[PDB]
Design a protein that fits this description.
The PDB classes it as chaperone. This is part of a larger assembly, with three copies of chain A. The first copy, chain A, has helices spanning about 10-20, 50-55, 65-80, 85-100, 105-125, 140-150, 160-170, 240-245, 260-265, 280-290, 340-365, 375-385, 395-405, 405-415, 420-430, 460-480; strands at about 5, 35, 45-50, 130, 170-175, 175-180, 185, 195-200, 200-205, 215, 220-225, 250-255, 270-275, 305-310, 310-315, 320-325, 335, 365-370, 440, 450, 455-460, 480-485. Chain A is α+β, with helices and mostly antiparallel strands. The first copy, chain A, has three domains: about 1-130 and about 365-485, GroEL-like equatorial domain (GROEL, domain 1, Orthogonal Bundle); about 135-200 and about 330-365, GROEL, domain 2, CATH 3.30.260; about 200-330, 3-Layer(bba) Sandwich (GroEL), CATH 3.50.7. In chain A, helix 1 (about 10-20) packs antiparallel against helix 4 (about 85-100) and helix 5 crosses helix 13. Chains A and B meet through helix 3, helix 5, helix 16 and strand 22 of A and strand 2, helix 9 and helix 11 of B. Strand 22 (about 480-485) of chain A pairs parallel with strand 2 of chain B, so a sheet runs across the interface. The structure holds adenosine-5'-diphosphate (3 copies) and magnesium ion (3 copies). One magnesium ion (MG) binds near residues 81, 147, 150 and 354 of chain C. One adenosine-5'-diphosphate binds near residues 33, 83, 84 and 442 of chain B.
């Protein structure tokens, strides 16, 4: 009863189990990286280059691996991009870790020295991260463009980065954070990808409750009701219906029900209304228009109304919805994504989510670094010298940790097709205490260039979060020498 | 019907079953000790170095072993640390016990002399335990730091011991005990471990009930309602809502429901409120702010309000919670634990629980001893001489009890990789009636040092509780000669 | 249809099935006797030296044996100690009985002569039982100490016997019996066995119903309510709450519910209260404090209040309970048992139950005899001479009944390790019409001593009850010649 793995078996089991989910996403890394198509047991397909979703949505069973998935799962949570790289490095730390274990270094010494180097690399980044203005709306767009590439250069549509930057800039809650949930993302087919647009307002999946109501209003004034406009059979409802026309509202969104008598009295007045709107769609409307959620229909002031420069019922991609667009001061915004087929749309969307993360991350943080595997080769040589000022075995650990980070430049080369080993040498010479700190491999060029100038940039949060969660988890894995599997 | 084990078979069965769950945690002992990863039948993993949880959360079936798990289960209950050592010694008393049984010593003679020595070692410790001031806030931190190490030297973050000491010192109930439950422990991801912090107040997993309410208040005055703020459809609620503004409260935590009419009247007043807060979260708030749990909304005095220097709704690690931080005189406190992944966080937490135990134990007790296996080698040689002043066989027992305790120094060496046998001799010479009583093996040094000075200290409760529950249970096991297993 | 045993087969079946559950507890007899660990089908373990529980809690199926368990089950019921010896003798009467049956003595002659000797030994004991004072508090403690030994000499803690004697002396219902149920036995972990103490009052597994109430009161006055203190929403409860403050009661134990309005009015007054207390805990409190169970809250007189010199809420072993200790004139008492692990506690408890029995038995009876197998060797030689004054076969029976009783001295020797046969001769010479009647084997000494002087004493009820239930049941077994087993 029933399965147990001892010592060098249990370590090899885990270190291997780790390297394997790592090697499973190695191939998506970079712009010249490939996508995984991922059916389940229901013929349900899902195609993506996004690291974490790949990991999440596959049946991974082995307990060691279950925990590298932890790393990716919290990278996405605390950044948005760089989920693959956090997992990939975590694998490469386990790889280098067994080169020392098979040299009879004690696990606790390895994990000591890994910690030591994770510590260093954290303040070593702090210092090699350029500062940026929270509204440097030009740099914000080089960041959002560097994010979309890597999901393929061909998604890197210029006028799409711009849309995103603008749309994250809108929902900034002074001060001074970005609520990644204030940007609503909607997907509807069309003949598009290029037709994706910013809607400064809200998209509601309802329709005017009475066909007799207006199907367009401009410069409308919006009344949001958390109440339920009842009726009966004796017009107890000309009250409720004329108290709303009393505030000046030509549009009304109700979360509860609107009885059939108070549907005719609204149509009769010229007021458009929708019943049973999602509670989530009610807060979306509360914020984007500048409105107020009223529970008491009597207490409906004339300043609890929002303002949108258009409220219209359209048929878009077959379905008919209520657009509340062209708002004045949006604290909620909608990204309307569009593409010919459904999974084409769904992956453009995962790309936008990664953008909106790294953009939110720059605004929030203020510091950024240079992509292309740049600040890994930097961060790795610096770590390599810090490594000499270390007496004892734990030194080997620290060099291994330093060599580990070179896995990002390395695999970025691989997928592009280039000769990983050479390119790594060129990029390692160009960091020799002089410049560049920004010297990295351009997988299109083919040769090493200046990434800060080619516009290849990434929030600092991407490499810090990634390097520490990769450290912390592999550290714990290495401490393990016995496993106890049942069933 | 069905299975029975006789005499030397039943004893060998139990003594063996015992030594086996003992040998199952031998490997976690000390800083250079390893962790067990522990899946169940649901792919559910849990990694830990904490003795008892390891034992608890594995399907141990054999009845003998079920009872060494008793020892660990009460060690954790009455101390917090030293669960592995209580079990480990318990095993080693069973090991030495059969060396006498296989020499035809009567079980009742063994158990007589084991009792005799357990008796002695109890007053032998009393005398070799240094005194300490309940607020010797320096020593308290050497104690909380000796605890976290042993779960790996790498968790031994200096500024984490300090946080814990401070936080256990706060919740001291004059006089004069520590309620290990007054320190709330919360876990939320972040890019951290280092980001774990002390919050002098409470963390509430709720959110302002009306979006229109303030989302920050400073120097707030807090009204806790054990009542239910009802409504209907005729503002019977401007009463309830203005009776609360009557006491001066700009924040309100309600355990029951807050009707939708009395949610609008609060938002209108500037008062923040949360409905249906855990009853446990209500007592946490009662104590930490200095508030009062009121059942009658009418009897809401203006001194039943607590005081916190900030009440804010934040999004931390995705989820949005209500922080009631920076309080004045906390009789409740929150340890916010943080780490990149989840099991990384979860084990830093088990480490903090052990700290909080041994810290609470020093404050409570006032006496401490020297770790590193120090007071075991002391306690063992002293016991060995007490052993000569014993006529009869029961002497053999007492020596075996004395030799038993050397298992802690021994296995601490093992895991470190050092030569157990030698190290035991060095440490045994350094106790020869002269000094040191504090002379123990430093597993980093490699050589025997003065543990009291290296800051390796442990509440007295760790070695007294452990040595006696190890004595009491193995005493009972040895009395057993027949077993009757069914099914 | 289906199984039947005839004549010499059915007798051999039963006489054998009897001797087998007898031989199953032979090993627990005496201080140098061993314990049985006893799992069931649920991994549920239970370790004990207590005869009856061993028998009870094992799946004994055979019908003959089902009935020796009868003997043990009523020994415990009518005495408390000497459950093993009643069963043991019962077995040894069956053993001797078949030596006569295999000599063609008619069953009815055997059972005639066994009855004859059981009759004799009953009045033969009457005369050789020393008298004692119901309050000879010194002898009472030699009795309660002789009881605990035999469950191992190592439980024989001196200051434990004393506690028990005192605690049985308290609950004496003049005149003049001991209600073994007036002494409440509670078990809570601690680092103890030595920490077990007498609490002159009651332990209640509840907690102050309102956190705002006092958590200590001294010299308190206690009001026990068999009523239900209701409420509603209009303070119909300041009535009920101030009628209680009218009698002068600062503590209140309610069996039914205390509504949430009448919980705030009590907290406000300074009165501590607990709702939904066990009905059994209500009678415990009725008697120990000197209180009165009131159903009508109006009829709450100022003399229906008890008196305890402390009522406090403590956390003891994790759980928090309401101690009502240090009472004045207890007619209920609590034995707080403590020990490191749970089964360690549970068997100390079974030891206390046996003590409380034999102590209650001396007080009640007033007569006692000398243990160590002493009055068995006496009782056996006397029976042996009575045996010569018997004409007919029925004489053989009577000698066999006399030889039977020597099984107690014999097995006490066995387990100690001594040579049963010799020791039996020594002890049989020392009874040769001169002294001693008190001459028995000390299993520590190794040689035969004067048991009355060594403080080895046992209520008379132990040897009378035991010798007659052993006689009555084996008498009935022997009368059986056909069995009819189904299924
Ligand atoms: N133009 C570019 N040339 C070379 N590398 C790039 C370029 N743009 C982005 N990258 C790199 O591609 C990587 C992104 O891989 P990706 O497929 O997005 O997975 P993840 O974002 O989780 O690492 C980042 O390391 C970034 O450094
Ligand atoms: N710096 C140190 N050097 C040597 N031993 C240590 C040091 N710090 C703690 N210890 C020892 O490590 C042991 C702790 O083992 P641990 O893994 O914490 O299990 P437990 O705490 O249940 O015994 C204690 O005996 C303590 O004496
Ligand atoms: N100090 C002693 N020396 C020898 N025999 C003893 C001593 N104390 C008690 N006994 C005997 O031990 C027996 C008790 O056995 P025990 O394990 O208590 O089962 P039970 O009490 O049901 O007979 C009693 O016959 C008593 O005569
Ligand atoms: Mg990307
Ligand atoms: Mg520990
Ligand atoms: Mg007994």
């Amino acid at each position: 009863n029933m399965k147990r793995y001892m010592g060098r078996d249990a370590q090899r089991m885990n270190i291997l189990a780790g390297r394997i989910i790592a090697e499973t996403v190695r191939s998506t890394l970079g712009p010249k990286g490939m996508d995984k198509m991922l059916v389940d047991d229901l013929g349900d397909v899902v195609v993506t280059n996004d690291g974490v979703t790949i990991l999440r949505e596959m049946s991974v069973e082995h307990p060691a691996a279950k925990m590298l998935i932890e790393v990716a799962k919290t990278q996405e949570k605390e950044v948005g991009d760089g989920t693959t790289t956090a997992v990939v490095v975590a694998g490469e730390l386990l790889r280098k870790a067994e080169e020392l274990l098979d040299q009879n270094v004690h696990p606790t010494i390895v994990v000591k020295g890994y910690q030591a180097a994770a510590q260093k690399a954290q303040e070593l980044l702090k210092t090699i991260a350029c500062e940026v203005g929270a509204q440097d709306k030009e740099i914000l767009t080089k960041i959002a463009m560097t994010s979309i590439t890597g999901k393929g250069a061909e998604k890197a549509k210029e006028k799409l980065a711009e849309i995103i930057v603008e749309a994250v800039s809108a929902v900034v809650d002074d001060e001074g954070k970005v609520d990644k949930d204030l940007i609503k993302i909607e997907k509807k087919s069309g003949a598009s990808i290029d037709d994706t647009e910013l809607i400064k307002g809200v998209l509601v999946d309802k329709e005017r409750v009475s066909a007799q109501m207006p199907k367009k209003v401009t410069d409308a004034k919006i009344a949001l009701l958390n109440c339920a406009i009842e009726e009966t059979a004796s017009e107890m409802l000309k009250d409720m219906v004329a108290e709303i026309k009393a505030s000046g509202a030509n549009v009304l969104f109700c979360q509860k029900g609107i009885d059939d008598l108070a549907q005719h009295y609204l149509a009769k007045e010229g007021i458009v209304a929708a019943r049973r709107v999602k509670k989530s769609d009610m807060e979306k409307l509360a914020k984007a228009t500048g409105a107020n959620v009223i529970t008491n229909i009597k207490d409906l002031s004339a300043q609890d109304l929002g303002d949108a420069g258009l409220v219209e019922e359209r048929k878009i991609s077959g379905d008919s919805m209520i657009f509340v667009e062209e708002c004045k001061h949006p604290k909620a915004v909608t990204m309307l994504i569009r593409g010919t087929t459904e999974h084409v749309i769904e992956e453009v969307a995962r790309a936008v989510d990664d953008a909106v993360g790294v953009v939110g991350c720059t605004i929030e943080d203020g510091r950024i670094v240079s992509g292309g595997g740049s600040t890994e080769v930097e961060l790795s040589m610096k770590l390599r010298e810090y490594a000499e000022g270390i007496s004892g075995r734990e030194q080997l650990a620290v060099r291994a940790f330093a060599d580990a980070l070179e896995v990002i430049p390395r695999t970025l080369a691989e997928n592009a097709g280039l000769d990983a080993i050479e390119i790594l040498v060129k990029v390692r010479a160009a960091h020799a205490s002089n410049g560049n700190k920004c010297a990295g491999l351009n997988v299109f060029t083919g040769a090493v260039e200046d990434m800060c100038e080619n516009g290849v940039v990434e929030p600092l949060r991407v490499k810090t979060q990634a390097i520490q969660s990769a450290a912390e988890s592999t550290e714990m894995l290495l401490r393990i020498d016995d496993v106890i599997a049942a069933e």
